[PDB]
Design a protein around this ligand. Structure first.
Ligand SMILES: N[C@@H]1C[C@H]2CC[C@@H](C1)N2c1cnc2c(-c3cccc(Cl)c3Cl)c[nH]c2c1
Length: 502
Protein backbone atom coordinates (compact mmCIF):
# COMPACT_ATOMS: atom_id res chain seq x y z
CA UNK A 1 0.00 0.00 0.00
CA UNK A 2 2.93 2.49 0.89
CA UNK A 3 5.87 0.39 -0.33
CA UNK A 4 6.80 3.35 -2.63
CA UNK A 5 8.40 5.14 0.39
CA UNK A 6 12.00 4.06 0.90
CA UNK A 7 13.21 5.37 4.32
CA UNK A 8 16.95 4.49 4.02
CA UNK A 9 17.77 5.03 0.27
CA UNK A 10 20.22 7.69 -1.11
CA UNK A 11 19.51 9.79 -4.23
CA UNK A 12 21.94 7.69 -6.32
CA UNK A 13 20.43 4.46 -5.09
CA UNK A 14 16.99 5.91 -6.07
CA UNK A 15 18.21 6.66 -9.63
CA UNK A 16 19.85 3.22 -9.96
CA UNK A 17 16.67 1.53 -8.64
CA UNK A 18 14.41 3.42 -11.09
CA UNK A 19 16.79 2.90 -14.06
CA UNK A 20 17.44 -0.81 -13.39
CA UNK A 21 14.16 -2.08 -11.77
CA UNK A 22 11.62 0.52 -13.01
CA UNK A 23 10.18 1.75 -16.27
CA UNK A 24 8.80 5.15 -17.42
CA UNK A 25 6.14 6.12 -14.87
CA UNK A 26 7.98 4.35 -12.04
CA UNK A 27 8.33 6.41 -8.84
CA UNK A 28 9.38 6.32 -5.22
CA UNK A 29 9.56 8.87 -2.33
CA UNK A 30 12.38 9.13 0.15
CA UNK A 31 13.60 11.37 2.99
CA UNK A 32 16.54 13.71 3.13
CA UNK A 33 17.59 12.01 6.42
CA UNK A 34 20.04 14.71 7.63
CA UNK A 35 17.57 17.62 6.90
CA UNK A 36 14.22 17.91 8.72
CA UNK A 37 11.02 17.57 6.70
CA UNK A 38 12.63 17.40 3.30
CA UNK A 39 11.45 14.56 1.04
CA UNK A 40 12.02 13.80 -2.60
CA UNK A 41 9.67 12.29 -5.12
CA UNK A 42 11.87 10.47 -7.68
CA UNK A 43 10.16 9.71 -11.01
CA UNK A 44 11.35 7.91 -14.16
CA UNK A 45 10.24 9.59 -17.44
CA UNK A 46 11.71 9.23 -21.02
CA UNK A 47 14.40 6.86 -19.59
CA UNK A 48 15.75 9.56 -17.20
CA UNK A 49 15.05 10.20 -13.46
CA UNK A 50 13.54 13.51 -12.13
CA UNK A 51 13.73 14.47 -8.44
CA UNK A 52 10.92 16.73 -7.07
CA UNK A 53 11.28 18.32 -3.63
CA UNK A 54 8.54 18.03 -1.01
CA UNK A 55 9.00 20.32 1.95
CA UNK A 56 7.26 20.11 5.28
CA UNK A 57 8.00 22.91 7.74
CA UNK A 58 5.25 21.70 10.10
CA UNK A 59 1.95 22.69 8.43
CA UNK A 60 1.59 20.58 5.29
CA UNK A 61 3.59 18.74 2.59
CA UNK A 62 4.40 21.21 -0.12
CA UNK A 63 5.24 19.50 -3.40
CA UNK A 64 7.41 21.77 -5.58
CA UNK A 65 5.36 22.77 -8.69
CA UNK A 66 2.33 20.92 -7.32
CA UNK A 67 -0.12 21.22 -4.50
CA UNK A 68 -0.12 20.96 -0.69
CA UNK A 69 -1.11 17.73 0.99
CA UNK A 70 -1.84 16.38 4.47
CA UNK A 71 0.13 13.07 3.98
CA UNK A 72 2.47 11.58 1.39
CA UNK A 73 -0.11 8.77 0.89
CA UNK A 74 -2.81 11.35 0.07
CA UNK A 75 -0.30 13.07 -2.27
CA UNK A 76 0.43 9.80 -4.13
CA UNK A 77 -3.29 8.86 -4.25
CA UNK A 78 -4.13 12.29 -5.75
CA UNK A 79 -1.60 12.13 -8.66
CA UNK A 80 -2.10 8.41 -9.26
CA UNK A 81 -5.79 9.33 -9.97
CA UNK A 82 -5.11 12.79 -11.67
CA UNK A 83 -1.70 17.41 -12.78
CA UNK A 84 1.99 16.96 -11.81
CA UNK A 85 4.49 19.10 -13.82
CA UNK A 86 8.22 19.99 -14.15
CA UNK A 87 9.67 23.58 -13.83
CA UNK A 88 9.25 23.84 -17.67
CA UNK A 89 5.63 22.67 -17.22
CA UNK A 90 5.87 19.16 -18.76
CA UNK A 91 3.46 16.50 -17.23
CA UNK A 92 5.21 13.95 -14.96
CA UNK A 93 3.09 10.78 -14.61
CA UNK A 94 3.14 8.68 -11.40
CA UNK A 95 2.14 5.25 -12.79
CA UNK A 96 4.08 2.46 -11.07
CA UNK A 97 5.12 2.52 -7.43
CA UNK A 98 8.62 1.06 -7.07
CA UNK A 99 8.24 -1.10 -3.97
CA UNK A 100 10.65 -1.06 -1.05
CA UNK A 101 11.82 -4.37 0.43
CA UNK A 102 13.37 -2.76 3.61
CA UNK A 103 11.53 -4.08 6.74
CA UNK A 104 12.76 -1.36 9.18
CA UNK A 105 9.48 0.68 9.13
CA UNK A 106 7.25 -2.32 9.79
CA UNK A 107 5.60 -2.52 13.19
CA UNK A 108 6.59 -6.21 13.54
CA UNK A 109 10.32 -5.77 12.68
CA UNK A 110 12.67 -5.68 15.73
CA UNK A 111 16.05 -6.15 14.00
CA UNK A 112 18.72 -7.12 16.54
CA UNK A 113 16.87 -8.95 19.30
CA UNK A 114 17.73 -12.28 21.02
CA UNK A 115 15.31 -15.19 21.45
CA UNK A 116 15.17 -14.78 25.22
CA UNK A 117 14.46 -10.99 24.89
CA UNK A 118 11.73 -11.76 22.26
CA UNK A 119 10.21 -14.37 24.63
CA UNK A 120 10.30 -11.93 27.57
CA UNK A 121 8.65 -9.12 25.54
CA UNK A 122 6.01 -11.53 24.12
CA UNK A 123 5.41 -12.92 27.61
CA UNK A 124 4.95 -9.51 29.32
CA UNK A 125 3.19 -7.47 26.60
CA UNK A 126 1.90 -10.05 24.12
CA UNK A 127 -1.39 -11.88 23.81
CA UNK A 128 -2.67 -14.58 21.38
CA UNK A 129 -1.43 -13.91 17.83
CA UNK A 130 1.18 -11.29 18.84
CA UNK A 131 4.28 -11.62 16.69
CA UNK A 132 7.61 -10.11 15.71
CA UNK A 133 10.43 -10.74 13.26
CA UNK A 134 14.01 -10.42 14.43
CA UNK A 135 17.48 -10.97 12.99
CA UNK A 136 18.91 -14.48 13.57
CA UNK A 137 21.95 -14.62 15.88
CA UNK A 138 22.82 -18.33 15.23
CA UNK A 139 22.46 -18.14 11.40
CA UNK A 140 23.48 -14.54 10.36
CA UNK A 141 21.56 -13.09 7.42
CA UNK A 142 18.52 -15.18 8.34
CA UNK A 143 15.55 -14.09 10.51
CA UNK A 144 13.16 -15.48 13.16
CA UNK A 145 9.40 -15.03 13.29
CA UNK A 146 8.41 -15.29 16.99
CA UNK A 147 4.69 -15.72 17.75
CA UNK A 148 2.70 -16.01 20.93
CA UNK A 149 -0.41 -18.22 21.01
CA UNK A 150 -2.81 -19.22 23.79
CA UNK A 151 -5.54 -18.37 26.27
CA UNK A 152 -5.40 -14.71 27.37
CA UNK A 153 -7.63 -15.28 30.47
CA UNK A 154 0.26 -21.49 33.84
CA UNK A 155 1.14 -23.11 30.46
CA UNK A 156 -2.09 -22.22 28.62
CA UNK A 157 0.06 -19.94 26.34
CA UNK A 158 3.42 -20.38 24.51
CA UNK A 159 5.94 -18.67 22.12
CA UNK A 160 6.94 -20.44 18.83
CA UNK A 161 10.07 -19.47 16.86
CA UNK A 162 10.00 -20.05 13.11
CA UNK A 163 13.23 -19.79 11.20
CA UNK A 164 13.18 -17.61 8.06
CA UNK A 165 16.06 -18.39 5.66
CA UNK A 166 17.47 -15.82 3.28
CA UNK A 167 18.64 -17.61 0.14
CA UNK A 168 19.61 -15.36 -2.81
CA UNK A 169 17.60 -12.30 -1.69
CA UNK A 170 14.44 -14.40 -1.24
CA UNK A 171 12.93 -15.47 2.09
CA UNK A 172 11.29 -18.76 3.11
CA UNK A 173 10.16 -20.76 6.16
CA UNK A 174 11.94 -24.00 5.07
CA UNK A 175 9.64 -24.94 2.21
CA UNK A 176 7.02 -23.70 -0.25
CA UNK A 177 7.04 -20.16 -1.65
CA UNK A 178 10.13 -17.96 -1.66
CA UNK A 179 9.36 -14.28 -1.08
CA UNK A 180 11.04 -11.16 -2.43
CA UNK A 181 10.98 -9.48 1.01
CA UNK A 182 10.09 -10.20 4.65
CA UNK A 183 6.93 -8.13 4.28
CA UNK A 184 5.61 -10.31 1.44
CA UNK A 185 6.38 -13.40 3.57
CA UNK A 186 4.65 -11.93 6.67
CA UNK A 187 1.62 -10.85 4.63
CA UNK A 188 1.37 -14.36 3.08
CA UNK A 189 1.56 -16.15 6.46
CA UNK A 190 -0.90 -13.56 7.87
CA UNK A 191 -3.53 -14.61 5.25
CA UNK A 192 -2.44 -18.30 5.18
CA UNK A 193 -1.21 -19.12 8.73
CA UNK A 194 1.32 -21.88 9.36
CA UNK A 195 -0.10 -24.97 11.10
CA UNK A 196 1.98 -27.14 13.40
CA UNK A 197 1.85 -31.00 12.94
CA UNK A 198 -0.32 -31.34 16.11
CA UNK A 199 -2.69 -28.59 15.00
CA UNK A 200 -1.75 -25.22 16.53
CA UNK A 201 -2.35 -22.34 14.09
CA UNK A 202 0.40 -19.76 14.24
CA UNK A 203 -1.99 -16.85 13.80
CA UNK A 204 -0.25 -13.54 13.04
CA UNK A 205 -3.01 -11.25 14.46
CA UNK A 206 -1.11 -8.16 15.71
CA UNK A 207 2.49 -6.89 16.02
CA UNK A 208 3.93 -6.80 19.52
CA UNK A 209 3.30 -3.42 21.08
CA UNK A 210 6.66 -1.85 21.98
CA UNK A 211 5.51 1.82 22.32
CA UNK A 212 3.05 1.67 25.27
CA UNK A 213 5.06 2.83 28.34
CA UNK A 214 4.30 3.63 31.92
CA UNK A 215 4.35 7.43 32.20
CA UNK A 216 6.82 7.20 35.13
CA UNK A 217 9.40 5.70 32.72
CA UNK A 218 9.09 8.50 30.05
CA UNK A 219 12.58 9.91 30.76
CA UNK A 220 14.15 6.46 30.16
CA UNK A 221 12.26 5.94 26.88
CA UNK A 222 13.21 9.45 25.66
CA UNK A 223 16.88 8.66 26.57
CA UNK A 224 16.82 5.41 24.48
CA UNK A 225 14.94 7.19 21.59
CA UNK A 226 17.49 10.07 21.64
CA UNK A 227 20.38 7.60 20.98
CA UNK A 228 18.30 8.16 16.34
CA UNK A 229 15.41 6.00 17.61
CA UNK A 230 12.81 8.81 17.43
CA UNK A 231 13.26 8.67 13.62
CA UNK A 232 12.51 4.92 13.28
CA UNK A 233 9.51 5.11 15.63
CA UNK A 234 8.12 8.05 13.64
CA UNK A 235 8.69 6.40 10.23
CA UNK A 236 6.97 3.20 11.53
CA UNK A 237 3.99 5.45 12.38
CA UNK A 238 4.13 7.16 8.92
CA UNK A 239 4.00 3.71 7.20
CA UNK A 240 0.53 3.13 8.57
CA UNK A 241 -1.00 6.36 7.15
CA UNK A 242 -2.07 4.25 4.08
CA UNK A 243 -4.70 2.70 6.40
CA UNK A 244 -6.32 6.18 6.76
CA UNK A 245 -7.29 7.02 3.16
CA UNK A 246 -10.90 7.66 4.20
CA UNK A 247 -13.28 9.51 1.87
CA UNK A 248 -13.40 13.30 1.74
CA UNK A 249 -16.19 13.59 -0.87
CA UNK A 250 -18.01 16.51 0.76
CA UNK A 251 -14.89 18.68 0.72
CA UNK A 252 -14.35 17.82 -2.97
CA UNK A 253 -17.80 19.16 -4.06
CA UNK A 254 -17.74 22.12 -6.41
CA UNK A 255 -19.83 24.15 -3.96
CA UNK A 256 -17.25 23.56 -1.16
CA UNK A 257 -13.97 23.99 -3.13
CA UNK A 258 -13.46 27.64 -2.11
CA UNK A 259 -14.27 26.83 1.60
CA UNK A 260 -10.85 25.04 1.88
CA UNK A 261 -7.57 26.83 2.45
CA UNK A 262 -5.85 24.18 0.37
CA UNK A 263 -7.91 22.29 -2.21
CA UNK A 264 -6.52 18.84 -1.24
CA UNK A 265 -6.38 19.20 2.56
CA UNK A 266 -9.93 18.11 3.42
CA UNK A 267 -11.96 16.77 6.29
CA UNK A 268 -12.94 13.09 6.37
CA UNK A 269 -16.67 12.66 5.68
CA UNK A 270 -17.18 10.40 8.71
CA UNK A 271 -15.90 12.95 11.23
CA UNK A 272 -16.59 16.36 9.59
CA UNK A 273 -18.56 18.94 11.45
CA UNK A 274 -21.99 19.17 9.70
CA UNK A 275 -23.56 22.64 9.92
CA UNK A 276 -27.36 22.69 10.35
CA UNK A 277 -29.89 25.54 10.08
CA UNK A 278 -28.15 27.35 7.21
CA UNK A 279 -29.60 29.86 4.76
CA UNK A 280 -32.16 27.77 2.70
CA UNK A 281 -31.18 29.99 -0.31
CA UNK A 282 -27.57 28.58 -0.30
CA UNK A 283 -27.69 25.13 -2.00
CA UNK A 284 -24.81 23.78 0.12
CA UNK A 285 -24.65 25.39 3.62
CA UNK A 286 -23.60 22.32 5.73
CA UNK A 287 -19.82 22.36 5.08
CA UNK A 288 -16.83 23.61 7.04
CA UNK A 289 -13.27 22.28 6.83
CA UNK A 290 -13.31 20.87 10.39
CA UNK A 291 -13.41 17.52 12.13
CA UNK A 292 -14.57 16.29 15.49
CA UNK A 293 -11.71 14.66 17.37
CA UNK A 294 -13.03 12.24 20.06
CA UNK A 295 -10.18 10.57 21.96
CA UNK A 296 -10.14 6.72 21.88
CA UNK A 297 -12.68 6.63 19.03
CA UNK A 298 -14.82 13.29 28.40
CA UNK A 299 -13.08 16.23 26.56
CA UNK A 300 -13.44 16.43 22.76
CA UNK A 301 -11.99 18.85 20.13
CA UNK A 302 -12.76 20.33 16.78
CA UNK A 303 -9.65 20.55 14.63
CA UNK A 304 -10.01 23.10 11.88
CA UNK A 305 -8.19 25.43 9.56
CA UNK A 306 -7.64 29.19 9.86
CA UNK A 307 -10.63 31.10 8.41
CA UNK A 308 -10.94 32.33 4.88
CA UNK A 309 -12.79 35.61 4.48
CA UNK A 310 -15.74 33.61 3.02
CA UNK A 311 -15.80 31.06 5.90
CA UNK A 312 -15.77 33.40 8.94
CA UNK A 313 -19.62 33.24 9.16
CA UNK A 314 -19.45 29.45 8.99
CA UNK A 315 -16.82 29.33 11.70
CA UNK A 316 -19.12 31.26 14.10
CA UNK A 317 -22.09 29.04 13.09
CA UNK A 318 -19.89 26.03 14.06
CA UNK A 319 -18.85 27.49 17.48
CA UNK A 320 -22.46 28.34 18.28
CA UNK A 321 -24.01 25.00 17.11
CA UNK A 322 -21.43 22.86 18.91
CA UNK A 323 -21.59 24.90 22.12
CA UNK A 324 -17.83 25.48 22.11
CA UNK A 325 -16.65 27.81 24.88
CA UNK A 326 -12.82 27.68 24.29
CA UNK A 327 -10.84 28.35 21.09
CA UNK A 328 -7.13 27.74 20.73
CA UNK A 329 -5.32 29.53 17.81
CA UNK A 330 -1.92 27.88 16.98
CA UNK A 331 -0.40 30.67 14.77
CA UNK A 332 -0.02 34.46 14.67
CA UNK A 333 -2.41 36.09 12.13
CA UNK A 334 0.67 36.61 9.95
CA UNK A 335 3.98 34.76 9.85
CA UNK A 336 6.79 35.32 7.33
CA UNK A 337 4.59 38.05 5.80
CA UNK A 338 1.95 35.40 4.87
CA UNK A 339 -1.58 35.07 6.29
CA UNK A 340 -1.73 32.06 8.58
CA UNK A 341 -4.86 32.80 10.58
CA UNK A 342 -7.26 35.48 9.31
CA UNK A 343 -8.79 37.80 11.99
CA UNK A 344 -12.39 36.69 12.64
CA UNK A 345 -13.12 38.48 15.92
CA UNK A 346 -13.78 42.17 16.66
CA UNK A 347 -11.24 44.63 18.03
CA UNK A 348 -11.19 44.95 21.82
CA UNK A 349 -14.47 46.46 23.20
CA UNK A 350 -16.13 46.34 19.70
CA UNK A 351 -19.18 44.36 18.49
CA UNK A 352 -19.54 42.90 14.97
CA UNK A 353 -22.11 40.73 13.24
CA UNK A 354 -20.92 37.73 11.24
CA UNK A 355 -24.08 36.79 9.34
CA UNK A 356 -26.64 35.59 11.91
CA UNK A 357 -24.00 35.64 14.76
CA UNK A 358 -22.99 38.58 16.92
CA UNK A 359 -19.64 38.78 18.68
CA UNK A 360 -18.52 41.25 21.35
CA UNK A 361 -14.80 41.34 22.31
CA UNK A 362 -15.22 42.10 26.07
CA UNK A 363 -11.56 42.20 27.06
CA UNK A 364 -8.08 41.15 25.93
CA UNK A 365 -5.41 40.03 28.39
CA UNK A 366 -1.79 39.55 27.29
CA UNK A 367 0.42 36.86 28.77
CA UNK A 368 4.01 36.04 27.65
CA UNK A 369 3.11 33.14 25.34
CA UNK A 370 -0.47 34.02 24.38
CA UNK A 371 -3.30 36.53 24.32
CA UNK A 372 -6.66 35.72 25.82
CA UNK A 373 -9.76 37.36 24.30
CA UNK A 374 -13.00 37.09 26.22
CA UNK A 375 -15.66 37.05 23.50
CA UNK A 376 -19.47 37.00 23.84
CA UNK A 377 -21.23 35.13 21.06
CA UNK A 378 -25.00 35.23 20.46
CA UNK A 379 -27.45 34.81 17.69
CA UNK A 380 -28.83 38.03 16.26
CA UNK A 381 -32.49 38.50 17.38
CA UNK A 382 -32.08 36.15 20.38
CA UNK A 383 -30.54 37.87 23.38
CA UNK A 384 -30.86 34.89 25.67
CA UNK A 385 -28.47 32.81 23.42
CA UNK A 386 -25.38 34.67 24.61
CA UNK A 387 -22.38 32.69 25.89
CA UNK A 388 -18.79 33.56 26.59
CA UNK A 389 -16.21 32.06 24.29
CA UNK A 390 -12.61 32.25 25.63
CA UNK A 391 -10.07 32.55 22.84
CA UNK A 392 -6.56 31.56 23.64
CA UNK A 393 -4.22 32.85 20.97
CA UNK A 394 -0.77 31.23 21.10
CA UNK A 395 1.76 33.75 19.74
CA UNK A 396 5.32 32.38 20.43
CA UNK A 397 5.42 29.20 18.33
CA UNK A 398 8.55 29.61 16.13
CA UNK A 399 8.16 30.32 12.38
CA UNK A 400 9.94 27.05 11.64
CA UNK A 401 10.25 23.90 13.67
CA UNK A 402 8.87 23.59 17.20
CA UNK A 403 9.43 25.40 20.51
CA UNK A 404 12.84 24.58 22.02
CA UNK A 405 11.20 24.28 25.47
CA UNK A 406 7.63 22.84 26.02
CA UNK A 407 6.93 24.89 29.18
CA UNK A 408 5.02 27.64 27.43
CA UNK A 409 2.83 25.14 25.52
CA UNK A 410 2.21 23.15 28.74
CA UNK A 411 1.31 26.21 30.92
CA UNK A 412 -1.02 27.36 28.14
CA UNK A 413 -2.76 23.97 27.84
CA UNK A 414 -3.07 23.82 31.64
CA UNK A 415 -4.92 27.15 31.65
CA UNK A 416 -7.06 26.16 28.63
CA UNK A 417 -7.95 22.90 30.41
CA UNK A 418 -9.03 24.64 33.64
CA UNK A 419 -11.10 27.14 31.70
CA UNK A 420 -12.90 24.35 29.85
CA UNK A 421 -13.37 22.36 33.11
CA UNK A 422 -14.95 25.45 34.83
CA UNK A 423 -17.80 25.70 32.27
CA UNK A 424 -20.72 23.29 32.79
CA UNK A 425 -21.65 21.43 29.64
CA UNK A 426 -19.04 23.23 27.42
CA UNK A 427 -18.81 21.63 23.98
CA UNK A 428 -15.62 20.64 22.18
CA UNK A 429 -12.57 22.83 22.37
CA UNK A 430 -11.87 24.33 18.96
CA UNK A 431 -8.17 24.16 17.95
CA UNK A 432 -7.17 25.88 14.70
CA UNK A 433 -5.18 27.99 12.30
CA UNK A 434 -3.12 27.38 9.10
CA UNK A 435 -4.33 24.02 7.54
CA UNK A 436 -5.42 22.72 11.01
CA UNK A 437 -3.30 19.52 10.99
CA UNK A 438 0.30 20.24 12.10
CA UNK A 439 0.41 22.51 15.13
CA UNK A 440 -3.31 21.73 15.68
CA UNK A 441 -2.61 17.98 15.76
CA UNK A 442 0.38 18.56 18.05
CA UNK A 443 -1.55 20.66 20.60
CA UNK A 444 -4.46 18.16 20.61
CA UNK A 445 -2.24 15.07 21.10
CA UNK A 446 -0.29 16.74 23.94
CA UNK A 447 -3.57 17.74 25.54
CA UNK A 448 -4.93 14.14 25.31
CA UNK A 449 -1.78 12.61 26.78
CA UNK A 450 -1.41 15.17 29.56
CA UNK A 451 -5.09 14.67 30.50
CA UNK A 452 -4.50 10.93 31.12
CA UNK A 453 -1.60 11.80 33.40
CA UNK A 454 -3.51 14.58 35.14
CA UNK A 455 -6.33 12.20 36.19
CA UNK A 456 -4.38 8.90 36.65
CA UNK A 457 -0.99 10.18 37.87
CA UNK A 458 2.58 9.25 36.81
CA UNK A 459 1.60 5.58 37.27
CA UNK A 460 -0.51 5.03 34.09
CA UNK A 461 0.15 3.83 30.52
CA UNK A 462 0.61 6.07 27.53
CA UNK A 463 1.26 5.17 23.90
CA UNK A 464 2.27 8.23 21.78
CA UNK A 465 2.08 6.69 18.23
CA UNK A 466 -1.12 4.74 19.02
CA UNK A 467 -2.76 8.00 20.20
CA UNK A 468 -1.59 9.86 17.10
CA UNK A 469 -2.88 7.09 14.79
CA UNK A 470 -6.26 7.31 16.57
CA UNK A 471 -6.38 11.16 15.97
CA UNK A 472 -5.13 10.77 12.32
CA UNK A 473 -8.15 8.46 11.71
CA UNK A 474 -10.35 11.50 12.52
CA UNK A 475 -8.55 14.20 10.44
CA UNK A 476 -5.85 13.84 7.83
CA UNK A 477 -2.22 14.10 8.82
CA UNK A 478 -2.72 15.21 12.41
CA UNK A 479 0.92 15.79 13.54
CA UNK A 480 2.96 16.61 10.43
CA UNK A 481 6.64 16.24 11.33
CA UNK A 482 9.22 14.24 13.27
CA UNK A 483 10.10 17.49 15.09
CA UNK A 484 6.48 17.72 16.38
CA UNK A 485 6.55 13.98 17.19
CA UNK A 486 9.67 14.48 19.41
CA UNK A 487 8.15 17.67 20.83
CA UNK A 488 5.06 15.65 22.05
CA UNK A 489 7.43 13.25 23.96
CA UNK A 490 9.34 16.23 25.38
CA UNK A 491 6.12 17.92 26.51
CA UNK A 492 4.91 14.72 28.27
CA UNK A 493 8.39 14.32 29.90
CA UNK A 494 8.46 17.96 31.10
CA UNK A 495 4.90 17.65 32.43
CA UNK A 496 5.84 14.45 34.39
CA UNK A 497 9.02 16.12 35.76
CA UNK A 498 7.22 19.36 36.92
CA UNK A 499 4.63 17.17 38.72
CA UNK A 500 7.48 15.23 40.55
CA UNK A 501 9.08 18.65 41.41
CA UNK A 502 5.86 19.78 43.20
N1 LIG B 1 10.22 -0.88 13.16
C1 LIG B 1 10.29 -1.03 14.65
C2 LIG B 1 10.33 0.34 15.32
C3 LIG B 1 10.14 0.18 16.83
C4 LIG B 1 11.11 -0.86 17.42
C5 LIG B 1 10.37 -2.18 17.33
C6 LIG B 1 9.03 -1.82 16.66
C7 LIG B 1 9.10 -1.85 15.14
N2 LIG B 1 8.82 -0.42 17.09
C8 LIG B 1 7.58 0.26 16.85
C9 LIG B 1 6.37 -0.41 17.07
N3 LIG B 1 5.15 0.12 16.88
C10 LIG B 1 5.13 1.42 16.45
C11 LIG B 1 4.03 2.27 16.17
C12 LIG B 1 2.57 2.02 16.27
C13 LIG B 1 2.02 1.73 17.52
C14 LIG B 1 0.66 1.52 17.66
C15 LIG B 1 -0.17 1.59 16.57
C16 LIG B 1 0.35 1.92 15.33
CL1 LIG B 1 -0.70 1.98 13.95
C17 LIG B 1 1.72 2.12 15.17
CL2 LIG B 1 2.34 2.49 13.62
C18 LIG B 1 4.55 3.47 15.76
N4 LIG B 1 5.91 3.40 15.81
C19 LIG B 1 6.28 2.15 16.23
C20 LIG B 1 7.52 1.58 16.43
Amino acid sequence: SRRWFHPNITGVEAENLLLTRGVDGSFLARPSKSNPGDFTLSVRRNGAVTHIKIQNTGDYYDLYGGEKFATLAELVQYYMEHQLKEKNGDVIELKYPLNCADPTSERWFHGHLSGKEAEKLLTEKGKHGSFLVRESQSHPGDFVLSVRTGDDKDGKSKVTHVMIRCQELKYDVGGGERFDSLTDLVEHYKKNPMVETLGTVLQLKQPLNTTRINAAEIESRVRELSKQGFWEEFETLQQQECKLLYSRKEGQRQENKNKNRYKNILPFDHTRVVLHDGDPNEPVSDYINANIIMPEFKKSYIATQGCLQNTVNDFWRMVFQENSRVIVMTTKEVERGKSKCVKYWPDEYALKEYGVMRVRNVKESAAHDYTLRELKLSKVGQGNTERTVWQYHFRTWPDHGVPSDPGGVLDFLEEVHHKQESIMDAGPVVVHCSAGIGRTGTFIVIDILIDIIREKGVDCDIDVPKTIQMVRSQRSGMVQTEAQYRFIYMAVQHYIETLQRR
